[PDB]
Swiss-Prot record, chains A, B, C:
Gene name, Swiss-Prot/TrEMBL: WDHD1
Location(s), subcellular: Nucleus, Nucleoplasm
Disulfide bridges in this chain: none
Protein name per Swiss-Prot or TrEMBL: WD repeat and HMG-box DNA-binding protein 1
Quaternary structure annotation from Swiss-Prot or TrEMBL: Trimer. Interacts with the polymerase alpha catalytic subunit POLA1. Interacts with MCM10. Interacts with DNA2. Interacts with CDC45 and GINS2 subunit of GINS complex; these interactions associate WDHD1 with the CMG helicase complex.
Organism: Homo sapiens (Human)
Length: 403, 403, 403
């Protein structure tokens, strides 16, 4: 027939890695460091580098078992290899931060089970296998819980107690993938935050990179340069926070995401001219792109301030998440966020007042604090906006009644 | 091959509209009013009518931008048009209920982004775009939050703070659609009630109409005349509440749903002979169909009363929803519902008692109030049903212990 | 084309039944009893047997209506038949445990609606029909709630107030099924525990058996012998608890699951040589297989004890479920479970201490009770593990601070 064709399911990958066929490739490049693998026919070597030299010294390994998957954190180095006709699939951990004399452990998966993806969390490690199993391990080598995956894994990321799994929930058509996300919190009270929700992607695009921001919010990038971030303040939906194609000059130009930071806001990525991944040598330079939510009429003052407001809102939801889970957060960052947002609301209200849009001013005042609304009432008494001042006063009464 | 064939995904639509190819078509017909579009080669006009003349005067617009999507509420008129080679896709709002002198605003979507569906809520508006984005706007023109859709939108509806999105979650086979529902509450505490649950449909049917009842419960109709309603009292499942094919006399006869009302119960729709949608002229007459849940042996007294009981139960769940969300509800309606249900239970218990089904009587008494159970005990002492009276007494003891 | 092919959706089935084409087949074989159907051209008979003769006497029925689906519980016998050109699809219940003189009821489904699956709960019965409807009935014959199914049903099971539905959520490819699970609790507070989550299956396998353990935990088996159980302590994920292929000697050997028991742990199944289901005559013998979670390096002492620990953890989650839902549970079973787990942790800590893996000892002590940690501190003071004793002491301080 001549209709929709099933899209081939994309293969699993480690975020921040370059393809396996390269002689000198990146196994992982994140906010902790870089892991490179030089593999020809004579020898196979793995080199580990840390951005902060104080964390650990440079580590060089002789890749005898031919490790093809790697992840790096401030605690350990995680390595994995598939099975051969003689050896089993192995998970290798270099626990360099351990305070004891045993800084290494390795485990063999059962017969005919191959590791397809790994990720490192805070004090734990996870491995998705060809048996549609997810195996949890402590950073010291204890086997934790095991559960089955609803489909073949695509990529896996970890941060703190959070586990971020993207897998094939179905079969897409006409170039589209059919991906689902399983988001778990592996603390003392186990929670499945997302029960295989559909992962939004740009049409005819595939998954290019997943992970967490340094502050601990799940994020991912598709092959069309669209960067999306979990919106905890919007029912755990996914909000686009950047479009790396706006910084590209041609079709063959791409950006290779390395890390995401919310405070200060910066998207650390490698500019790539001619391909989607940078060559290992010479050392590529990390670029810093700004985040921009895809808002309408962003060239106008209204659209510009509206984008700045909602970007400030979503990039400070992590403070509430750190508070709800007992983590440590700076109360000063929370206060600066509110002041930054109340200033943008106040400037947007003054703009709507100049445009004689007084109903819009009351809508903006609904997002304001009680102090900001009281200030907007006196600004409305000024400039002879008498009815607007009355509507704002009635809004201030309603806000005080909500307490 | 000769097997299952992929079903073509149905295109987005506005509920209560007639096809675009008509010279004189309905853009939207709901419980607020009617919006018609007359478009030939000479001129293009849009006419707005309100069922209640006291709400607003009849509005006539010169459709210069060729708006093809429309929605209507007691607050504003929402219009949208796709992009051309010279103009961008635009969202136009006629805020006629505004108390200020600015009763109009329009916004341009970014390049190559087209509006595919719109809907109006209480004080807000939403637009699903070709970029798989959902854009939220206040009724006054402020851009609110934005998040990505898991698939191409099919239809969109709003009521109060609730957002009702139906989209393609996959690809169906053999005439079946693969639809998912995302139900959000956009109040001060954002909630995603349904994380893309599968939307039940009749086999080989497509989505024909979605929306909310006047009381605020999500409902939808498929192409086979099956009307389904969210069952908040049954874990947010979907319960069939009507079958418009029972009122049709032939295959070519159809009913075109306009609105759904829970108190009093009535399904307002347009009878259509020969097609699925009514012609614009002459003005079609609104028919009132009754709701009937698809219960077994409904011709018998037992099945008839069982259908009346569960229809009364599901059509009063909205009272609990209005109470939990601080909305205003009549306590008298809640009391009349319970009295209506306790009377049906009492008549079903008397029927089971006549049939010497005393175990069934105790099952019916489990659904009764403590006062109704005490009354059933004295009715069981009467007519010499001594063991039944003892079982009902032990049930009354258990009910008092649950407090 | 030459690519992925759509997998034909498997047909609905009753767990514990043998195919319909057999002259003498099992309609259901569970922990309550056996129901056999002998059907040739001369006569059609249904025989009911109870494992405990004290429950009820053996029942013999003349299958005049040609019932093809059956389920059995300690309360009633449930039978169902499809519709013919003269008769409707019927649901028949033999309420043998009733304390009244009416121990039978039957109901007719509407025109062109056929029963596809049934299941028995505590005091209720459910039937999934060809109209994508789920109909609830009390054990005495009262019609309860009705809601629509997101797809064609595959199998259905019930236990207490829990309803376990597996259905087709999509179309799989290359031999894979696309199954979803809807898990409901039908008590006085209706809850949808699983909103159509994807059902994990072994690749290229179909669903072979579903049901609940005697303690009330959902479980299911695929065609590759993998037995999975709901992990309530792991965010309602699914954990493999057995692999019946490890007990098979050849490809043609299979195990036919009958029941699952958590305390004592035993998987009751019928060994089958040459086919997937046992012949009705002679009476097959019920085998008892042990549960084994698929852990790595299970031949080693570490892997063996780690498997025993997590098997003990998951097979005692039902005690917490019985407690949260007011059910009756033995506090002695909960105490024996903790003692069994603290002993395994203590032996694993002593093993890690012998291997000079002191960081791993602290990880194991995190899973210990406060008394077990205090004991591990004195064991660490012994054998001159001074730093380990300090780390365990700081862990004991942190545990006391969590109260």
């Amino acid at each position: 027939y001549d209709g929709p064709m099933p899209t081939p399911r994309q293969k699993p990958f480690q975020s921040g890695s370059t393809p396996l066929h390269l002689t000198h490739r990146f196994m992982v490049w994140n906010s902790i460091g870089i892991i490179r693998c030089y593999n020809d026919e004579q020898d196979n070597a793995i080199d580990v580098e840390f951005h902060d030299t104080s964390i650990h010294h440079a580590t060089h390994l002789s890749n005898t078992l031919n490790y093809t998957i790697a992840d790096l954190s401030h605690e350990a180095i995680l390595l994995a290899c598939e099975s051969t006709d003689e050896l089993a699939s192995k998970l290798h951990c270099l626990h360099f931060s351990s305070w004891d004399s045993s800084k290494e452990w390795i485990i063999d998966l059962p017969q005919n089970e191959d590791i397809e993806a790994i990720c490192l969390g805070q004090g734990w490690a996870a491995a998705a296998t060809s048996a549609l199993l997810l195996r949890l391990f402590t950073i010291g080598g204890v086997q934790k819980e095991v559960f089955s995956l609803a489909g073949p894994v695509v990529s896996m990321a970890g941060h703190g107690e959070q586990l971020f799994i993207v897998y094939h929930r179905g079969t897409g058509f006409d170039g589209d993938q059919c991906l689902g996300v399983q988001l778990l919190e592996l603390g003392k009270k186990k929670k499945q935050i997302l029960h295989g929700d559909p992962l939004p992607l740009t049409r005819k695009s595939y998954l290019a990179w997943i992970g967490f921001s340094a502050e601990g919010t799940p994020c991912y990038v598709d092959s069309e340069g669209i960067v999306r971030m979990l919106n905890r303040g919007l029912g755990n939906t996914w909000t686009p926070i950047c479009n790396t194609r706006e910084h590209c000059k041609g079709k063959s130009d791409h950006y290779w995401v390395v890390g995401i930071h919310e405070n200060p806001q910066q998207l650390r990525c490698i500019p790539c001219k001619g391909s989607r991944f940078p060559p290992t040598l010479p050392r590529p330079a990390v670029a810093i792109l700004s985040f921009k939510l895809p808002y309408c009429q962003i060239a106008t003052e209204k659209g510009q301030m509206e984008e700045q407001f909602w970007r400030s809102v979503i990039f400070h939801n992590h403070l509430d998440y750190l508070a709800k889970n007992g983590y440590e957060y700076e109360e000063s960052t929370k206060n600066q966020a509110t002041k930054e947002q109340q200033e943008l609301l106040m400037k947007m209200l003054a703009l709507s007042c100049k445009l004689e849009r007084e109903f819009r001013c009351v809508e903006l005042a609904d997002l304001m604090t009680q102090n900001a609304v009281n200030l907007a009432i006196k600004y409305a008494s000024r400039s002879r906006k008498l009815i607007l001042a009355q509507k704002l006063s009635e809004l201030a009464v309603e806000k005080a009644a909500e307490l």
